[PDB]
Amino acid sequence: SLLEFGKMILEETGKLAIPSYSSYGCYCGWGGKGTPKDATDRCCFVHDCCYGNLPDCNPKSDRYKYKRVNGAIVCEKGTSCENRICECDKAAAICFRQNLNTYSKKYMLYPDFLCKGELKC
Numbered sequence: 837s838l839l840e841f842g843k844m845i846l847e848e849t850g851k852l853a854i855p856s857y858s859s860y861g862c863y864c865g866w867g868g869k870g871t872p873k874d875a876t877d878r879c880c881f882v883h884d885c886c887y888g889n890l891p892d893c894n895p896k897s898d899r900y901k902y903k904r905v906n907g908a909i910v911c912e913k914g915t916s917c918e919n920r921i922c923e924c925d926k927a928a929a930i931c932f933r934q935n936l937n938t939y940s941k942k943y944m945l946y947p948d949f950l951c952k953g954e955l956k957c
């Protein structure tokens with residue numbers, strides 16, 4: 837659920853889901869349209885897509901359990917949705933961690949009209 841994802845984010849990037857990633861680029865936090873502005877934005881685009889493969893699930897509210905073996909994120913067995921949701925969030929976290937070096941504040945609160953064009957998953 838949104839609750840786990842943010843915590844996962846924080847541990848991974850040292851940044852807070854809100855407001856560091858809740859309104860970044862064209863896909864972080866609300867998604868919808870345009871061309872992902874950067875790597876971090878790309879992470880969100882993929883992440884939205886991931887959630888997309890689970891029409892009959894509820895990512896925002898279904899909670900899952902996970903542990904860190906050492907530095908690694910390991911999703912614990914739960915419902916199928918729960919497991920596939922976790923794998924989606926884990927990917928996004930690692931992704932964020934992998935592009936922290938290019939995170940740009942000029943993309944915080946990015947205005948909607950500056951996101952043109954559809955991009956397929």
Ligand SMILES: O=C(O)Cc1ccccc1Nc1c(Cl)cccc1Cl
Nearest residue numbers: 838841842853857858864865880883
């Ligand atoms: O893909 C993302 O960056 C995350 C993302 C996508 C869709 C919806 C919400 C979020 N994040 C989000 C979180 Cl992670 C916590 C509190 C409030 C919000 Cl809106």
